[PDB]
Amino acid sequence: NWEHLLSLKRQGDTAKRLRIEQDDTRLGFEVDYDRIIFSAPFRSLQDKTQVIPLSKDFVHTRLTHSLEVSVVGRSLGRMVGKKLLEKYPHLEQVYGYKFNDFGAIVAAAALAHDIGNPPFGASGEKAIGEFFKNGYGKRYKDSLTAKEYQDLIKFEGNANGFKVLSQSKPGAQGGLRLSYATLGAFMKYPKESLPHKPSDHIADKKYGFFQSERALFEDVAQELGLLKRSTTDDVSWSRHPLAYLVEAADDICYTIIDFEDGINLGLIPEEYALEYMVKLVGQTIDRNKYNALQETSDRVSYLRALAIGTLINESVDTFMKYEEEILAGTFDQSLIDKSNYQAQITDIINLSIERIYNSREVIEKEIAGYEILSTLLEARCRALDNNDTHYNQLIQQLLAPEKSLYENLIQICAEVSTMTDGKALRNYKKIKGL
Amino acid sequence: NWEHLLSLKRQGDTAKRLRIEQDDTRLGFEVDYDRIIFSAPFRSLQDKTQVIPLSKDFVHTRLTHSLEVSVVGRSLGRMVGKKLLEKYPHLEQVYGYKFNDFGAIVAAAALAHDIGNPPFGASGEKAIGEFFKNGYGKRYKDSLTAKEYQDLIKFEGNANGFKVLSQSKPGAQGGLRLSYATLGAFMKYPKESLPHKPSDHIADKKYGFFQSERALFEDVAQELGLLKRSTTDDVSWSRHPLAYLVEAADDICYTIIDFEDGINLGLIPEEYALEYMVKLVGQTIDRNKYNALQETSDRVSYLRALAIGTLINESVDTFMKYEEEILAGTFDQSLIDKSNYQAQITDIINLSIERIYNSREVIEKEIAGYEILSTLLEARCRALDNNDTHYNQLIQQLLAPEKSLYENLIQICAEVSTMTDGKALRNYKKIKGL
Ligand SMILES: Nc1nc2c(ncn2[C@H]2C[C@H](O)[C@@H](COP(=O)(O)OP(=O)(O)OP(=O)(O)O)O2)c(=O)[nH]1
Ligand SMILES: Nc1nc2c(ncn2[C@H]2C[C@H](O)[C@@H](COP(=O)(O)OP(=O)(O)OP(=O)(O)O)O2)c(=O)[nH]1
Ligand SMILES: Nc1ncnc2c1ncn2[C@H]1C[C@H](O)[C@@H](COP(=O)(O)OP(=O)(O)OP(=O)(O)O)O1
Ligand SMILES: Nc1ncnc2c1ncn2[C@H]1C[C@H](O)[C@@H](COP(=O)(O)OP(=O)(O)OP(=O)(O)O)O1
Ligand SMILES: [Mg+2]
Ligand SMILES: [Mg+2]
Ligand SMILES: [Mg+2]
Ligand SMILES: [Mg+2]
């Protein structure tokens, strides 16, 4: 039920924090927002790849993408919360909740939803995985549990993001110490790395936490009241209802903005821009304003602003139509896939894949990223092995100012993923002496 | 009075927008926030100098600084608005205002408060001015009005920010079309470029708009009901009350974060970090937590988080103590200057000036920036003069995809200030063929 889903608990708490005992100027979710804003992991997003590597231009990075997702998520959360308190009046009438709380939760979750991504993006994650699969790290296969090896060979940015958010350090336990509602709404694949893709459900495409933090998530999963889907030997719970909204906001934003940026770069003609969006923007377009503009940028910006407004309302309608199934855990798709504009979205995505992801420029950067990440990971792993050599001591002093082998390897992968693109490239040249 | 200060009017409006007729999910100030978030001028802040040029590291840029100022400003606005509606109940009881509106106004104003700054920062502005003062642009002195020449030789980032926010383009008038309350709260020097520093008041140190937009500000200044301070031949109004809060937030944030970054870089020892902040953090510090931490970063982050919380409350107290004078226009200082911690702030600022601004690293970058900006401005100005040469046509096609001389020169200065540091450097090398 909804009372346990909006928990204000933080790690290490003993008492019970109640909504009616909060300070209304600064609620806990706003504190979460402010704690994410002021941290270094959030700042490192400014020079991390969204689509085009090493482009910190007029193209998007992870930071600006996260900000746009935050705005869209705040809007979605406010509408859905107003409709929910309309449906269940006891929430507001007894517990003391307002529709701004839902917006704060979704905004905070959407702000930190990519905070664990490594440099170079998808190619970076695949390179980290291939290093342990077919490279040097393969030699560790026999020393590790099967699920730990699966963690290392299918490295996921979501698990690393959870690790960053809930990291324990000497003298400061809990990390950022976010609320449990925010951690639940941030969590989109509540399962371990094995088994690999059991079903066709949407919460099974990947995994969301490592083996070193499973216990932590267990605590979270038992406070919110999430339904359990497996207890044999591998735990898996159902989604928090607001993770659907977070995912919808992320999908809308990147789907539209990638097209707009590709048009502005010179890779997609504007005829496609009008053709694939006339249906989306037809219900609110004022042709006069469209015909007055004299630049491609103004036209594409107008079209994007209209399309986002249409899609947000459609998503809210879908969520309120399937609320019961979502709360019961039986809803196996995304809110976007149940929309009237699926064909247009698929056409835009296919055009983006053909014209942007496979561009020469984009390709060369990913190959360079593969080389850089492999070099840095091999250096760290060889330093971890010997430990007695002078060279090993130098590498330790440069790249790292009692734990198990799995903990050491996962820490190595986490430290590689903190770097930006430029810092990784600079370290690569310094290692090579170039 | 306060009823006219919180105006929801936009440029080109004919009717009257009322607060009670708004959609509560998305008020106008949130629309302003979202319009700033999604624009290209805001995105260009990601690679612009805050203190250390060409450092897009773990140091701050203009974008992250603006986000932190937005958080602090939202908090300040919420507290001040709650106290105001406590003082004047008729606002809420009749007009229908809530204390979140003040926070939205201050957050939107603080988000765009540096949007007109050029690359390389203060050195960049001084280079643009010196170009017209002692360089090529001096030849235009005889063709321009005195106030226009003063505009060109004392180039200000605030005037350029107003120009960016309220720019008119073919087919889209008004630019971002922000609310008038937001434009007033963004405006901190409501005067022209002449006379130069008439008095010791705080609204006279600089100027806030160009001659090409004076008329525009007049409209704004007459809708809010701002008091007039000069009508002889040069217009000058008093400050919007919330500009004080915007300035306080900006001062707090940069004053603390510059010290923290200098400590993390290796230019200031940590002994000073404890010595100059023990008084600030003494009222809420838990020594146990401070002694548990084992890294400099954790300690300085803790101290910064405590200091910001102390300063915010002190600023709110000062504002509510001098509200009457501020509303009457007789308050001639800043809220920070009337605080109990002025000595500590001055010590930290002096240490920052001695240790960070005059570092070798910082110095070399500013000299390079002077060279780059002078080259680009001279190229644009020589292209504007001749117009018939083949080279001039090439420069026009590269650097610029019926107006007066002053309009052309101010547009040149505005187009130079859109570039980031990296883009300016790349264009400089391409001009030199290197
Ligand atoms: N360059 C490049 N970019 C890609 C490729 N595949 C995806 N992208 C970029 C384009 C999208 O804007 C961006 C979205 O990345 P996400 O990790 O957020 O993807 P997704 O929504 O599938 O999220 P997920 O990790 O599955 O939850 O990734 C690729 O093969 N090459
Ligand atoms: N590198 C360098 N940075 C400087 C210098 N002077 C100021 N800064 C940097 C440090 C501060 O964090 C930052 C603040 O710039 P602002 O333009 O916001 O200054 P201010 O608050 O005086 O604002 P204003 O334009 O007068 O309203 O400028 C300087 O001489 N060199
Ligand atoms: N409903 C929404 N909620 C949140 N963000 C939105 C919404 N609609 C659009 N956005 C995003 C993308 C837009 O570029 C930006 C500004 O929105 P907005 O100013 O309402 O768009 P617009 O130009 O279509 O305006 P209007 O509807 O007044 O004509 O915010
Ligand atoms: N009152 C405030 N309003 C807005 N932002 C604030 C405030 N105080 C601090 N900040 C900024 C700077 C902090 O690094 C960041 C997070 O604040 P916060 O979590 O309250 O600080 P803290 O670590 O001192 O916590 P606490 O008071 O719970 O011990 O937000
Ligand atoms: Mg994302
Ligand atoms: Mg709209
Ligand atoms: Mg600033
Ligand atoms: Mg605090």
Strand A236-237 with B236-237, pairing = unpaired
From B198's Cα to the closest Cα of chain A, the distance in A is 39
Interface contact flag, B60 A40, Cβ < 8 Å: no
Distance B183 CA to ligand 2 centre (A): 22
DSSP-derived secondary structure for A330-388: ---S-TTTTSTTHHHHHHHHHHHIIIIIT-HHHHHHHHHHHHHHHHHHHHHHHHHHH-S
Tell whether A239 is in a known binding site. no
SS3 state of residue B286:
coil
**Residue A120 in contact with residue A49, Cβ under 8 Å?**
yes
| b (16+ CB within 10 A) / e for A106-132 | bbbbbbbbbbbbbbbbebbbbbbbbbb
Distances (CA, A) of A423 to A33, A54, A369, A420, B250: 27, 11, 12, 5, 29
B60 CA from centroid of ligand 2 (Å): 13
Give the Cα separation of A53 and A50 in Å (integer): 7
d(CA B414, CA B418): 7
CB-CB neighbours of B237 under 10 Å: 24
**Residue A113 assigned as binding residue:** yes
Q: Residue B237: beta bridge partners?
A: B228
Contacts with A238 (C-beta within 8 Å, 6 or more apart), sequence order: A190, A203, A226, A227, A228, A229, A329
Q: How far is CA A390 from the centre of its chain?
A: 40
In three-state secondary structure terms, B169 is strand
Q: Which of B26, B38, B44 sits opposite A75 (nearest CB)?
A: B26
Q: Cβ-count burial of B146 within 10 angstroms (0-12 exposed, 13-18 middle, 19+ buried)?
A: exposed
Who among B26, B46, B68 is closest to A46 (CB)? B46
DSSP type of residue B94: I
Q: Among B26, B60, B68, whose Cβ lies nearest the Cβ of A37? A: B68
Q: Could you tell me which chain B residue has the CA closest to the CA of A66?
A: B37
Q: How far is it, in rounded angstroms, from Cα B311 to Cα A184?
A: 33
CB neighbour list of residue A395: distance below 8 Å, 6 or more residues apart:
A379, A380, A382, A383
What is the longest distance spanned by two Cα atoms in chain A? 74
Contact state of B64 with A43 under an 8 Å Cβ cutoff: yes
Per CB-CB distance under 8 Å, the chain B contacts of A170 are 292-294
**Nearest-CA neighbor of A311 among A285, A339, A351, A349?**
A339
Q: Contact, B246 vs B319, CB < 8 A?
A: no
Does ligand 1 lie within 6 Å of residue A122's CB atom? yes
